[PDB]
Design a protein around this motif. Structure first.
Motif, short mmCIF file in Angstrom:
data_model
loop_
_atom_site.label_atom_id
_atom_site.label_comp_id
_atom_site.label_asym_id
_atom_site.label_seq_id
_atom_site.Cartn_x
_atom_site.Cartn_y
_atom_site.Cartn_z
N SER A 60 1.01 -1.32 -0.13
CA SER A 60 -0.40 0.37 0.09
C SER A 60 1.01 1.36 -0.32
CB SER A 60 -0.85 -0.23 1.69
OG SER A 60 -2.19 -0.93 0.72
N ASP A 64 -7.55 -7.02 2.22
CA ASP A 64 -8.82 -6.63 1.67
C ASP A 64 -8.43 -4.96 1.27
OD1 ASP A 64 -11.84 -6.44 1.25
OD2 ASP A 64 -11.71 -4.59 2.31
N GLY A 65 -8.82 -4.58 -0.13
CA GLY A 65 -8.25 -3.19 -0.34
C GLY A 65 -6.36 -2.93 -0.28
N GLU A 93 -5.84 -1.27 -3.15
CA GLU A 93 -7.21 0.24 -3.80
C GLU A 93 -5.85 1.72 -3.37
OE1 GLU A 93 -10.21 0.53 -0.67
OE2 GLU A 93 -7.67 0.06 1.02
N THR A 94 -4.80 1.28 -2.96
CA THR A 94 -4.29 2.63 -3.17
C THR A 94 -3.43 2.79 -3.86
OG1 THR A 94 -2.91 3.66 -1.51
CG2 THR A 94 -2.97 1.43 -1.00
N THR A 111 -3.06 3.91 -7.56
CA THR A 111 -4.11 4.99 -7.88
C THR A 111 -3.21 5.05 -9.72
OG1 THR A 111 -3.80 7.23 -7.92
CG2 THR A 111 -4.94 5.74 -6.32
N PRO A 146 -10.91 -8.20 -3.81
CA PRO A 146 -11.71 -6.66 -4.36
C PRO A 146 -11.24 -5.64 -4.50
CG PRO A 146 -11.37 -7.71 -1.68
CD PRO A 146 -10.95 -8.18 -3.42
N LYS A 147 -12.05 -4.06 -4.12
CA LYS A 147 -11.41 -2.78 -4.30
C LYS A 147 -9.47 -2.66 -5.54
CE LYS A 147 -13.01 -2.03 0.17
NZ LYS A 147 -11.80 -1.91 1.37
N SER A 152 -8.96 1.40 -10.67
CA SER A 152 -10.30 1.91 -11.93
C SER A 152 -8.56 2.16 -13.14
CB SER A 152 -10.49 3.33 -11.75
OG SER A 152 -9.93 4.58 -11.83
N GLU A 211 -19.92 -8.56 -9.44
CA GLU A 211 -18.75 -7.50 -9.20
C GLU A 211 -17.34 -7.56 -9.63
OE1 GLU A 211 -20.50 -5.76 -7.28
OE2 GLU A 211 -18.41 -4.43 -5.96
N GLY A 228 -15.56 -1.94 -11.18
CA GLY A 228 -14.56 -0.04 -11.72
C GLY A 228 -13.55 -0.10 -12.43
#
Ligand SMILES: *[C@@H]1O[C@H](CO)[C@@H](O[C@@H]2O[C@H](CO)[C@@H](O[C@@H]3O[C@H](CO[C@H]4O[C@H](CO)[C@@H](O)[C@H](O)[C@@H]4O)[C@@H](O)[C@H](O[C@H]4O[C@H](CO)[C@@H](O)[C@H](O)[C@@H]4O)[C@@H]3O)[C@H](O)[C@H]2NC(C)=O)[C@H](O)[C@H]1NC(C)=O
Ligand SMILES: *[C@@H]1O[C@H](CO)[C@@H](O[C@@H]2O[C@H](CO)[C@@H](O[C@@H]3O[C@H](CO[C@H]4O[C@H](CO)[C@@H](O)[C@H](O)[C@@H]4O)[C@@H](O)[C@H](O[C@H]4O[C@H](CO)[C@@H](O)[C@H](O)[C@@H]4O)[C@@H]3O)[C@H](O)[C@H]2NC(C)=O)[C@H](O)[C@H]1NC(C)=O
Ligand SMILES: *[C@@H]1O[C@H](CO)[C@@H](O[C@@H]2O[C@H](CO)[C@@H](O[C@@H]3O[C@H](CO[C@H]4O[C@H](CO)[C@@H](O)[C@H](O)[C@@H]4O)[C@@H](O)[C@H](O[C@H]4O[C@H](CO)[C@@H](O)[C@H](O)[C@@H]4O)[C@@H]3O)[C@H](O)[C@H]2NC(C)=O)[C@H](O)[C@H]1NC(C)=O
Ligand SMILES: *[C@@H]1O[C@H](CO)[C@@H](O[C@@H]2O[C@H](CO)[C@@H](O[C@@H]3O[C@H](CO[C@H]4O[C@H](CO)[C@@H](O)[C@H](O)[C@@H]4O)[C@@H](O)[C@H](O[C@H]4O[C@H](CO)[C@@H](O)[C@H](O)[C@@H]4O)[C@@H]3O)[C@H](O)[C@H]2NC(C)=O)[C@H](O)[C@H]1NC(C)=O
Ligand SMILES: *[C@@H]1O[C@H](CO)[C@@H](O[C@@H]2O[C@H](CO)[C@@H](O[C@@H]3O[C@H](CO)[C@@H](O)[C@H](O)[C@@H]3O)[C@H](O)[C@H]2NC(C)=O)[C@H](O)[C@H]1NC(C)=O
Ligand SMILES: *[C@@H]1O[C@H](CO)[C@@H](O[C@@H]2O[C@H](CO)[C@@H](O[C@@H]3O[C@H](CO)[C@@H](O)[C@H](O)[C@@H]3O)[C@H](O)[C@H]2NC(C)=O)[C@H](O)[C@H]1NC(C)=O
Ligand SMILES: CCOCc1nc2c(N)nc3ccccc3c2n1CC(C)(C)O
Ligand SMILES: CCOCc1nc2c(N)nc3ccccc3c2n1CC(C)(C)O
Ligand SMILES: *[C@@H]1O[C@H](CO)[C@@H](O)[C@H](O)[C@H]1NC(C)=O
Ligand SMILES: *[C@@H]1O[C@H](CO)[C@@H](O)[C@H](O)[C@H]1NC(C)=O
Ligand SMILES: *[C@@H]1O[C@H](CO)[C@@H](O)[C@H](O)[C@H]1NC(C)=O
Ligand SMILES: *[C@@H]1O[C@H](CO)[C@@H](O)[C@H](O)[C@H]1NC(C)=O
Ligand SMILES: *[C@@H]1O[C@H](CO)[C@@H](O)[C@H](O)[C@H]1NC(C)=O
Ligand SMILES: *[C@@H]1O[C@H](CO)[C@@H](O)[C@H](O)[C@H]1NC(C)=O
Ligand SMILES: *[C@@H]1O[C@H](CO)[C@@H](O)[C@H](O)[C@H]1NC(C)=O
Ligand SMILES: *[C@@H]1O[C@H](CO)[C@@H](O)[C@H](O)[C@H]1NC(C)=O
Lengths: 751, 751
Positions: free
Chosen positions: A125, A152-153, A156-157, A159, A176-177, A180, A198, A202
């Motif tokens: 992360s 989890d995630g 996500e960070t 980007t 997940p997460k 994009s 699902e 994204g």
């Protein structure tokens, strides 16, 4: 100022260092501080701290892969001092964990082939500049390992991340997460039996999705393979792909699909390439609603969809294939059918851009060849490996489901339309074999068990062939008019036709060589040629290159036989001659003088030569390259300057030479590259490499010589320090065999 | 009392010394004075005087062949002091003359392959004890040489001479005045156009006459060949042979005979072997009056009589062939015909003793196989190298015109009637291929381009085949029932069937192996086997030998794959396994432990192994021979005797071992033969080779180790004298690699 242990190179205004494969036990501190790239791969290094890379300001890339060779320890924050660091390659190090304290300057990180089962926020992360992340091949097959835990995630960070590869790990669920920003996503062999609505939502930018090998087709797999229960198909949600409008690349190979839902592709107007290999698609190939949904698809791979235990007469192609407008390459291998009829390919015939059909490994017994004519643009017809008759072992950076090399050699294909019939049964070419074919510039007949005597009529139906591969047959060259119907022939490959040549009692005729106006390249290799009938000489006005390797010149040039003395003389244009692997103990002087004077390149390597008469080079004014490697030569002339003005490259490696003559290089101003490696040299004298006039020598390879490290070698070091314009590679492999205490040491380090 | 430089052997109660190939610059003075025979061949010795052999009383034999290796100077009377010298071999010494003053005790003298152009009374006529005199190969082919002057009556005085070989010299006439004791006279390739009545008149003891190559047939000759004017036949006077009533062997090969005079054989009741090869005899083979003269003839060679430029439909065999009632072997190779019909061989079918028929190299397209059953005694049917479809380079001691090796491998022929179909076009074996054959025990299908899937019905008509050679085909092993119809099958050779094995995508089935109750030997070598379908194990209760060389066990036993872990375990009777050339870096322990415990012999040689687990030898109580040669191994166990009760031979040559662990030879009582040659050993400590208890070691091979020659070796030298029961071969090749002043010296000579 001679770089050690690493080799310094110049690339795009940036200097890089190659330290790889040098048997190093730790990070060398002698690395030049101006280096922007450093390759440490394939060494013995067991440890990394913040003290390894110190003083390196501009370093953007480090390769630590494959360390140690045959438990790499990285400290927390070992790389932290490096501000400019972009790309870090950690592959194959047995890392139990992602190393902590990785710099935030990382745009690319490869952990491939390690022990890491845990992807944590703690290690990942924090690095927000990541473009590419390679986690692949940590847990797979029968390896002892654990299921991958993805917190989890964790992703996500980042980007900025455009590429994520989780392939060959136990996942069972799409993470997940996901950011994009994702362009390419690799989920191959991750044990994901279900893809939901699902999962990919994204990602509006996805160029590539790899789901391959989830619920694999396991019959006859050359790897440990575990199917979904009962061997069920992967479950893809009807809407799983609805939000991917940008997808170029979709790999569904080995997902056990019996059914393609056409609405998967509803939202994918631009899809370039679809990998459908190793599924059960014979049903879908015949009906195939989804083929109506693929107007822009260039490459379709349907290979190995065969029905187990079935050998059907014909391949059943849906008319809806005609809806594939942009199609360039169509790959059907391992469909397994008996016979190709002209009307079975009707749907393909109107497609404007289709240049490639790949029918390999179908066990096809017969083809109606007139069918390829009725196509439009075909440049490549690949029929290799069929029954057609007359009338860690896996590279993690490679495609797992097929080889990525060209179907046809580029050098053949570049001549025009290509027909590859190799590894088939055509043992005799009859009068009608090639009728109703396109105009073929490139033909591969290799490995057909053809025993026929080519008489000059066999290729008349395709007279424009430039490049002919006849290798690995048993051809009987009994006819002087053989092949002469192809008047435009440039390259001819006869390799591995030794069957009849080896028999002294039958007749052998190579005379057809002289009948070609444009013949450029001829490969006669590994034919075991020791005897010819009535005509002992090869003759061509055009021929540029002749590969004679793997024959018996030791017999042909036997001291008691006059007959083959001129064997190569009649090749008047010849610049490249390969005499290697002829079992040559000595070449008769007259035989050497009879080699074409036009030669710029001569390979005598991998023979037994104990003797070379250097005087004879005086008759070869154009000779730039003499390759003597892999012989028994114990002696070097001291006169070489008066033997040649032209010699640029002299390869002496793997010989017995114990000494370097005084003024060996005096006045030879032509010589750029001298390879003395793997010889018996104890040392090198003062007068050996000294010259008063100009010298262009830029490279000297000494590695593998048993240097005596006493003060006698001091002058050579002084020569090395004086001339830095002369590149000496692998200085770590230039090694003192004596004195006893200097054993194993490099000759570049001494009192 | 260790013999140097020679190796001294005990033969027939006598003692011979082997000094050959030792790079000796002169005759060793250290030769035991009790030696009866001395082989100095293939050395560098340039001089022989009367001081060379001093002290040797009982020497009966001296071999000087090939000195110097790459002009041997023999002084007048050099060999005179040897009273018991019988045999002297002087071959390939570039002798310009016969050496003067040779002992009168010589029974056999060989001057073959020298420069001697003059046979004089001075050199020869005084040796009245000569039985065998070999002067051959002094002037031949394109060699620069003189016509041989044979001094009149030179052989006349040699009244015990039974063998005279003058072959391959330019003679032009049979020498007059030959002794009547001659048994064997070799005149081959002597350029004699005419044989008069006087030439052999008095030789009533002659059992062998060789006139071959006089007026040779030169078309397609694989040597420089000069025909008589017009390519005419040798001229043999009607009475030339009239007095040779004892002739057993007559060689007329390549004399250009169009016609055979039947009266040549009038007086030859005993003639056994007749060599008619390389003549123009097609007419005579059809008419053959002379055949009536040879009812006692055992071997007839008619090979290579083909008419130039002719490919007739049938061979035409005279009815008169029925007259050869003692015929054992008939050789007709190179007759050149298309088809063999049952009637064509009628004249041979009643010959009581004919067990061998050789049809090699006829380009035969088809045979009616039922004809072979009408014969009486056929044991060898040699059809090799045809077109059958589905239904110095010359050894001076060998035959010049054909190989003398067996037509069929003896291991195969020993089982019974043999059919050799190798090197043909039978690419598919159909239902009727083998019908109407005799009961064939031994069958050679090698190199037939056979691509078929053998299903179990192909051999049913010859169910008794014991030895099956399938090598060098492309066999598709797709059926578990393959070959199982041959229930008595003992030996099976599948070598060089790699074609389909190398393709991962097709199916591979080896299960048929288990169905054989009597299968003993199985050769799977060079098949490139990396993957199998559904059944990963080889299983047989019968199998004794398995050759797995040239496959991929590196892939099969790859860490991440557990499937092949048991691959050889199911062979419960297996005593011999060859794992060579499998590219093995290491073997997984459990994979090793699953090798059959019954193994007496195991070859792991020529792999890449850096690691061997010696402990694992515990599970192999019967293991006599372990072959580790040609690997990367650095490490030996000091505990070895704990791991093996049974190990007799251990071959470690060509590995990386630099050190012998302390207390090794301790407790291993089984090991007679240990090869450490071509390793990295600098020295051997005292500690290595001590044992308290008994040591049965009879050979230890050290050659090629970079020995350190300090007093640190004196420990080992000490051991060597104190055990003379352990022979170290190639002592001259056990060589000190330091100090620099000790270089090249054998370790056996030092302060
Ligand atoms: C399912 O199907 C998909 C789509 O076909 C496959 O995706 C491809 O996967 C392969 C193998 O992983 C990729 O091949 C590799 O591409 C790398 C990317 O190179 C890019 O950047 C370089 C330099 O910047 C450019 O030259 C290049 O054009 C690309 O833009 C290369 O770095 C790799 O090369 C290295 O390894 C190979 C093999 O050892 C060497 O020959 C090279 O010299 C070099 O060392 C390699 O070519 C490919 O890029 C993927 N396609 C796309 C579109 O990205 C999946 O692999 C497939 N799934 C399975 C399991 O088969
Ligand atoms: C029978 O003999 C023939 C004739 O020699 C053989 O065919 C040749 O095979 C050689 C290799 O052995 C080929 O040489 C190689 O060609 C490659 C193709 O490169 C093309 O494209 C590149 C750009 O990608 C261009 O640089 C190049 O100009 C070509 O347009 C090169 O990539 C190779 O170069 C590399 O290797 C060589 C050493 O092998 C180095 O010297 C180079 O610096 C570089 O590292 C190489 O030049 C050759 O093209 C073939 N010729 C023909 C007519 O096809 C057959 O293989 C042989 N048959 C058998 C069975 O062996
Ligand atoms: C025309 O036809 C005639 C008749 O066929 C040929 O005569 C034969 O010639 C060959 C080759 O010269 C002879 O073969 C050699 O015979 C030697 C003599 O052996 C005898 O004595 C030894 C023991 O002392 C016995 O073992 C043997 O059975 C005989 O009693 C052998 O010593 C030779 O073997 C050695 O050389 C060969 C080849 O290098 C090796 O393979 C062997 O291992 C060994 O080292 C060899 O076998 C043969 O004996 C002759 N026949 C007769 C009856 O004398 C002519 O050669 C032929 N003309 C031409 C030009 O071809
Ligand atoms: C597939 O694999 C099979 C099985 O390995 C191979 O066939 C065997 O190959 C070896 C040769 O490498 C054969 O072994 C040799 O047998 C010779 C036969 O001698 C027979 O007769 C003599 C008396 O004249 C007897 O002494 C003996 O008992 C036999 O009955 C021996 O002469 C050989 O011994 C010599 O060489 C070996 C090393 O190779 C030394 O150990 C000896 O000291 C001596 O120097 C040797 O033992 C074996 O017989 C073959 N077996 C069968 C069943 O045919 C195939 O060749 C292979 N296929 C391919 C294509 O490679
Ligand atoms: C005609 O067909 C034959 C058989 O299909 C072709 O032979 C194949 O050639 C390819 C490409 O050169 C070989 O692959 C390469 O092998 C080398 C050496 O291991 C490796 O360095 C390369 O990376 C690549 O893998 C392949 O071995 C060979 N196959 C066989 C069985 O011979 C041939 O190339 C075709 N001729 C033409 C004109 O294309
Ligand atoms: C079936 O037929 C094949 C082809 O005719 C036979 O193969 C041949 O085997 C012979 C005998 O072993 C080989 O000759 C030998 O070569 C070795 C090594 O060079 C040499 O040392 C020997 O002196 C001998 O000359 C020969 O190479 C080989 N021929 C070919 C083209 O492969 C095979 O032996 C037959 N099988 C049986 C059971 O007879
Ligand atoms: C014993 C061998 O005699 C020479 C020869 N060489 C070949 C050859 N390389 N190929 C052939 C193909 C078909 C028919 C005959 C031959 C042939 N032949 C036979 C003949 C046509 C008589 O030359
Ligand atoms: C892509 C091929 O996959 C499996 C296979 N392996 C083989 C084989 N070794 N041999 C065959 C011979 C004839 C017909 C089919 C096959 C065959 N086949 C085809 C099939 C009959 C469907 O198994
Ligand atoms: C055919 O190929 C050309 C480029 O090679 C391209 O311009 C054109 O769009 C293609 N046509 C189709 C139907 O995709
Ligand atoms: C080559 O073969 C053709 C067809 O068999 C034949 O017409 C011609 O005479 C042959 N040429 C030769 C034998 O050189
Ligand atoms: C000689 O070789 C060159 C290079 O391929 C070629 O351009 C020229 O045409 C050749 N000469 C002849 C006579 O074919
Ligand atoms: C080298 O060849 C020359 C011919 O230019 C010849 O005079 C000389 O004898 C040869 N040298 C050797 C050592 O054979
Ligand atoms: C030859 O054959 C007959 C029977 O056909 C047999 O009696 C005789 O013993 C055989 N002769 C020899 C020498 O083998
Ligand atoms: C092998 O072939 C036979 C004959 O075609 C066939 O009956 C049998 O089913 C096959 N066995 C297999 C496929 O294993
Ligand atoms: C085991 O091998 C021996 C030696 O060949 C043999 O006598 C015996 O028959 C074999 N065992 C079986 C079950 O065939
Ligand atoms: C050798 O094999 C034994 C199994 O008996 C195993 O315990 C040991 O670890 C192995 N040694 C090595 C170094 O792998």
């Amino acid at each position: 100022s001679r770089s050690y242990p690493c080799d310094e190179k110049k690339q795009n205004d940036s200097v890089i260092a190659e330290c790889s494969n040098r048997r190093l036990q730790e990070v060398p501190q002698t690395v030049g501080k101006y280096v922007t790239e450093l390759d440490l791969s394939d060494n013995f290094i067991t440890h990394i701290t913040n003290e390894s890379f110190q003083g390196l300001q501009n370093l953007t890339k480090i390769n630590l892969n494959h360390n140690p060779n045959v438990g790499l320890n990285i400290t927390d924050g070992a790389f932290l001092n490096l501000k400019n660091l972009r790309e870090l390659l950690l592959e194959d190090n047995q890392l139990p964990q992602i190393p902590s304290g990785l710099p935030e300057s990382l745009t690319e990180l490869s952990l491939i082939q390690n022990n890491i089962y845990n992807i944590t926020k703690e290690g990942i992360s924090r690095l927000i500049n990541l473009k590419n992340l390679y986690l692949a091949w940590n847990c797979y097959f029968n390896k002892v390992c654990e299921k991958t835990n993805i917190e989890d995630g964790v992703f996500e960070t980042l980007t900025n991340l455009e590429l994520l590869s989780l392939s060959f790990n136990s996942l069972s669920h799409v993470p997940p997460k996901l950011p994009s920003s994702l362009r390419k996503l690799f989920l191959s062999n991750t044990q994901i039996k279900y893809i939901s609505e699902e999962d990919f939502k994204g990602l509006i930018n996805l160029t590539l999705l790899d789901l391959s090998g989830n619920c694999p087709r396991c019959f006859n797999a050359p790897f440990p393979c575990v199917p979904c229960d009962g061997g069920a198909s992967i479950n893809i949600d009807r809407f799983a792909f609805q939000n991917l409008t940008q997808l170029r690349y979709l790999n569904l190979s080995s997902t056990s699909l019996r059914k393609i839902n056409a609405a998967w592709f509803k939202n994918m107007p631009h899809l370039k390439v679809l990998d459908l290999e190793f599924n059960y698609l014979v049903g879908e190939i015949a009906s195939g609603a989804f083929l109506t949904m693929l107007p822009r698809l260039e490459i379709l791979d349907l290979s190995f969809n065969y029905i187990k235990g079935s050998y059907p007469q014909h391949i059943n192609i849906s008319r809806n294939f005609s809806k594939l407008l942009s199609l360039r390459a169509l790959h059907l291998r391992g469909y397994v059918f008996q016979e190709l009829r002209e009307d079975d390919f009707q749907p393909l015939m109107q497609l404007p851009n289709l240049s490639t059909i790949n029918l390999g490994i179908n066990f096809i017994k017969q083809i109606d060849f007139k069918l390829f004519q009725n196509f439009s643009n075909l440049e490549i017809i690949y029929l290799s490996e069929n029954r057609i008759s007359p009338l860690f072992e896996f590279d993690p950076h490679s495609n797992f489901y097929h080889f990525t090399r060209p179907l046809i050699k580029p050098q053949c294909a570049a001549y025009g339309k290509a027909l590859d019939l190799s590894l088939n049964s055509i043992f005799f070419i009859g009068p009608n074999q090639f009728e109703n074919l396109p105009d073929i510039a490139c033909l591969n007949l290799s490995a057909n068990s053809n025993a026929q005597v080519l008489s000059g009529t066999e290729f008349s139906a395709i007279p424009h062939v430039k490049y002919l591969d006849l290798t690995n047959n048993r051809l009987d060259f009994d006819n002087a008019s053989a092949l002469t119907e192809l008047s435009d022939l440039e390259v001819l490959d006869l390799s591995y036709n030794s069957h009849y040549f080896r028999i002294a009692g039958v007749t052998h005729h190579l005379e057809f060589i002289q009948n070609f106006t444009n013949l450029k390249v001829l490969n006669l290799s590994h034919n075991n040629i020791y005897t010819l009938t009535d005509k002992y000489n090869l003759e061509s006005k055009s021929l540029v290159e002749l590969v004679f390797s793997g024959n018996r010149l030791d017999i042909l040039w036997n001291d008691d036989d006059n007959r083959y003395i001129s064997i190569f003389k009649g090749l008047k244009n010849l610049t490249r001659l390969d005499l290697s692997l002829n079992r040559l103990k000595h070449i008769p002087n007259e035989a050497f003088l009879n080699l074409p004077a036009s030669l710029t390149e001569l390979h005598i390597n991998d023979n037994m030569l104990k003797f070379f008469n250097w005087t004879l080079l005086q008759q070869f004014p154009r000779l730039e390259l003499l390759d003597l490697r892999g012989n028994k030569l114990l002696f070097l002339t001291d006169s070489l300057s008066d033997f040649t003005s032209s010699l640029r490259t002299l390869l002496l490696s793997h010989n017995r030479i114990s000494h370097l003559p005084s003024g060996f290089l005096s006045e030879v101003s032509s010589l750029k590259h001298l390879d003395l490696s793997s010889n018996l040299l104890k040392t090198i004298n003062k007068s050996a490499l000294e010259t008063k006039t100009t010298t262009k020598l830029s490279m000297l390879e000494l590695h593998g010589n048993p240097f005596e490290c006493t003060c006698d070698i001091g002058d050579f070091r002084r020569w090395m320090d004086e001339h830095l314009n002369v590149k000496i590679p692998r200085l770590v492999d230039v090694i003192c065999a004596s004195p006893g205490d200097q054993r194993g040491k490099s000759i570049v380090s001494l009192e």
